[PDB]
Design an enzyme around this catalytic site. Structure first.
Site, PDB file in Angstrom:
ATOM      1  N   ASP A  18      24.030  14.619 -18.860  1.00  0.00           N
ATOM      2  CA  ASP A  18      24.332  13.549 -17.593  1.00  0.00           C
ATOM      3  C   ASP A  18      25.205  12.221 -17.956  1.00  0.00           C
ATOM      4  O   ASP A  18      25.091  11.524 -17.280  1.00  0.00           O
ATOM      5  CB  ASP A  18      23.113  13.376 -17.263  1.00  0.00           C
ATOM      6  CG  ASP A  18      23.034  12.835 -16.215  1.00  0.00           C
ATOM      7  OD1 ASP A  18      23.987  12.906 -15.328  1.00  0.00           O
ATOM      8  OD2 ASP A  18      21.620  11.508 -15.908  1.00  0.00           O
TER       9      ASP A  18
ATOM     10  N   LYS B 171      14.934  10.022  -9.545  1.00  0.00           N
ATOM     11  CA  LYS B 171      14.201  11.222  -9.276  1.00  0.00           C
ATOM     12  C   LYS B 171      13.136  11.268 -10.586  1.00  0.00           C
ATOM     13  O   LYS B 171      12.055  12.076 -10.248  1.00  0.00           O
ATOM     14  CB  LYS B 171      14.821  12.616  -8.975  1.00  0.00           C
ATOM     15  CG  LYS B 171      13.954  13.324  -7.950  1.00  0.00           C
ATOM     16  CD  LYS B 171      15.144  14.791  -7.821  1.00  0.00           C
ATOM     17  CE  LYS B 171      15.289  14.509  -6.782  1.00  0.00           C
ATOM     18  NZ  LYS B 171      14.606  14.831  -5.146  1.00  0.00           N
ATOM     19  N   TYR B 172      13.537  10.295 -11.699  1.00  0.00           N
ATOM     20  CA  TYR B 172      12.429  11.244 -13.039  1.00  0.00           C
ATOM     21  C   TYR B 172      11.942   9.636 -13.525  1.00  0.00           C
ATOM     22  O   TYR B 172      10.930  10.096 -14.560  1.00  0.00           O
ATOM     23  CB  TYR B 172      12.988  11.417 -13.947  1.00  0.00           C
ATOM     24  CG  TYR B 172      13.389  13.596 -13.136  1.00  0.00           C
ATOM     25  CD1 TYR B 172      12.715  14.712 -12.849  1.00  0.00           C
ATOM     26  CD2 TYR B 172      14.794  13.951 -13.332  1.00  0.00           C
ATOM     27  CE1 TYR B 172      12.843  15.361 -12.856  1.00  0.00           C
ATOM     28  CE2 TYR B 172      14.904  14.993 -13.020  1.00  0.00           C
ATOM     29  CZ  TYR B 172      13.865  15.909 -12.135  1.00  0.00           C
ATOM     30  OH  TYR B 172      14.366  17.399 -12.152  1.00  0.00           O
ATOM     31  N   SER B 173      12.389   8.197 -13.169  1.00  0.00           N
ATOM     32  CA  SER B 173      11.411   7.404 -13.477  1.00  0.00           C
ATOM     33  C   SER B 173      12.375   6.027 -12.501  1.00  0.00           C
ATOM     34  O   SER B 173      13.172   6.493 -11.806  1.00  0.00           O
ATOM     35  CB  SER B 173      12.079   7.569 -14.714  1.00  0.00           C
ATOM     36  OG  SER B 173      13.670   7.225 -14.799  1.00  0.00           O
ATOM     37  N   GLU B 174      11.800   5.338 -13.169  1.00  0.00           N
ATOM     38  CA  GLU B 174      11.648   3.967 -12.907  1.00  0.00           C
ATOM     39  C   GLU B 174      11.782   2.502 -13.769  1.00  0.00           C
ATOM     40  O   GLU B 174      11.233   2.766 -14.800  1.00  0.00           O
ATOM     41  CB  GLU B 174      10.093   3.389 -11.967  1.00  0.00           C
ATOM     42  CG  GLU B 174      10.644   2.103 -10.997  1.00  0.00           C
ATOM     43  CD  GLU B 174       9.264   1.904  -9.936  1.00  0.00           C
ATOM     44  OE1 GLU B 174       7.871   1.763  -9.699  1.00  0.00           O
ATOM     45  OE2 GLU B 174       9.484   1.772  -8.422  1.00  0.00           O
TER      46      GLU B 174
ATOM     47  N   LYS C 162      11.487   1.985 -19.459  1.00  0.00           N
ATOM     48  CA  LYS C 162      11.726   2.558 -18.193  1.00  0.00           C
ATOM     49  C   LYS C 162      10.486   3.750 -18.329  1.00  0.00           C
ATOM     50  O   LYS C 162       9.240   3.764 -19.236  1.00  0.00           O
ATOM     51  CB  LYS C 162      12.288   3.468 -19.161  1.00  0.00           C
ATOM     52  CG  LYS C 162      12.799   5.801 -18.071  1.00  0.00           C
ATOM     53  CD  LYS C 162      14.269   6.236 -19.303  1.00  0.00           C
ATOM     54  CE  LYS C 162      14.144   6.940 -17.513  1.00  0.00           C
ATOM     55  NZ  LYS C 162      16.060   7.780 -18.382  1.00  0.00           N
TER      56      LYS C 162
ATOM     57  N   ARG D 200      14.664   3.036  -9.482  1.00  0.00           N
ATOM     58  CA  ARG D 200      14.437   4.184  -9.415  1.00  0.00           C
ATOM     59  C   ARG D 200      15.166   5.196  -8.845  1.00  0.00           C
ATOM     60  O   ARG D 200      15.961   5.339  -7.555  1.00  0.00           O
ATOM     61  CB  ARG D 200      13.426   3.818  -7.873  1.00  0.00           C
ATOM     62  CG  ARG D 200      12.346   5.012  -8.220  1.00  0.00           C
ATOM     63  CD  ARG D 200      11.091   4.578  -7.650  1.00  0.00           C
ATOM     64  NE  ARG D 200      11.369   4.997  -6.321  1.00  0.00           N
ATOM     65  CZ  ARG D 200      10.489   3.926  -5.460  1.00  0.00           C
ATOM     66  NH1 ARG D 200       9.415   2.892  -5.429  1.00  0.00           N
ATOM     67  NH2 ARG D 200      10.607   4.468  -4.121  1.00  0.00           N
TER      68      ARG D 200
END
Ligand SMILES: CCc1ccccc1-c1c(Cl)cc(CNCCc2nc3ccccc3[nH]2)cc1Cl
Length: 327
Positions: free
Chosen positions: A154, A47-50, A66, A45
């Site tokens: 990224d 900051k934007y997805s699991e 995702k 997990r």
């Protein structure tokens, strides 16, 4: 004000292609069946997805799912459009399906499964040859996405999946990816602190594909010098000081002066005056097996303050560092 800049490569890709290609906000998402996938276990997990390991029931094949968090659920179209544009490209993770998660009520992206080799094992045991091999595979992914008008923004070890048994590499997590439009000012709050290019750190918004190249150089330096991370900033300001302790402050001032960038005044009390260090300073008996003049020459051509002076991914592929790699 700041002097404008544009990429020295692939500037016209977005203009050449139709608007549907880059106007992600107009893209209509075709949804699949959430029932085709059974979640097996949570892998992580952020900051934007699991992210989860899952199984596609129709073909009994493992997949990665995702599930986007609501805070990311806005700019989901951008990631979806980028993933569809790049699908089938060398070493790009394949988006297999898009479904609505019944619990989160957010989109869930389904990807091809990569059986990842443990990340500590790879860092500890990859050989000089394997490092060159995998760096070449990342360059194929980067030249592909840049040639497609997209910058990853990224690049870091976490976003690169490797199945070492099958010599399989995939560049993942395109959530921060953006289309490159010459003259566009982009948010500088992208990538991860240790991989942030000097352009981001000095708040220069008109950046291009070259930021990915700086991040790639940070990965290489870490690996060959056995120093994780290579530039270990305590915060975004100290991150620039850590780079300046290696690349020197004179070339930093030459860079900001070239683009008429004014450093944040908080740098006056912390930046100091530092000479450029010779890459040989970082060599020792525990990393000599991974360092060569070709490695150092290649690293020197990625880790440059001036974004316009870094090697491009396609030029980097013909560097002597890769001559040993079986092609
Ligand atoms: C230090 C970076 C580096 C430099 C030069 C050559 C290879 C690497 C590298 C290594 Cl050692 C390990 C990995 C492995 N990274 C795994 C990332 C990962 N595994 C996942 C498993 C599940 C979900 C997400 C995931 N992300 C990637 C690279 Cl590029």
């Amino acid at each position: 004000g700041p002097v404008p800049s544009r990429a020295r490569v692939y500037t016209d890709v977005n203009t050449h292609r139709p608007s549907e290609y880059w106007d992600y906000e107009s893209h209509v998402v075709e949804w699949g069946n959430q029932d085709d996938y059974q979640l097996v276990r949570k892998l992580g997990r952020g900051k934007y997805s699991e992210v989860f390991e899952a199984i596609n029931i129709t073909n009994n094949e493992k997949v990665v799912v995702k599930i986007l968090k609501p805070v990311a659920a806005a700019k989901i179209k951008r990631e979806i459009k980028i993933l569809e544009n790049l699908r089938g490209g060398p070493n790009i993770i394949t988006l297999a399906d898009i479904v609505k998660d019944p619990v989160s009520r957010t989109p869930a992206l389904v990807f091809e499964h990569v059986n990842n080799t443990d990340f500590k094992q790879l860092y500890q045991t990859l050989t000089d040859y394997d490092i060159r091999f995998y760096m070449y595979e990342i360059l194929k992914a980067l030249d592909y996405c840049h040639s497609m008008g997209i910058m990853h923004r990224d690049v870091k070890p976490h976003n690169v999946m490797i199945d070492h048994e099958h010599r399989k590499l995939r560049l993942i997590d395109w959530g921060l990816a953006e289309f490159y439009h010459p003259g566009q000012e982009y948010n500088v709050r992208v990538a991860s602190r240790y991989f942030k290019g000097p352009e981001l750190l000095v708040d220069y918004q008109m950046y291009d594909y070259s930021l990915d190249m700086w991040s790639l150089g940070c990965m290489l330096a870490s690996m060959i010098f056995r120093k994780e991370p290579f530039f270990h900033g305590h915060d975004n300001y100290d991150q620039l000081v850590r780079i300046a302790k290696v690349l020197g402050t004179e070339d930093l001032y030459d860079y900001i002066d070239k683009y008429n960038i004014e450093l944040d005044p908080r740098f006056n009390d912390i930046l100091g005056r530092h000479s450029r260090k010779r890459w040989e300073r970082f060599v020792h008996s525990e990393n000599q097996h991974l360092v060569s003049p070709e490695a150092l020459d290649f690293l020197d051509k990625l880790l440059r303050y001036d974004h316009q002076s870094r090697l491009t991914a396609r030029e980097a592929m013909e560097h002597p560092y890769f001559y040993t790699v079986v092609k």
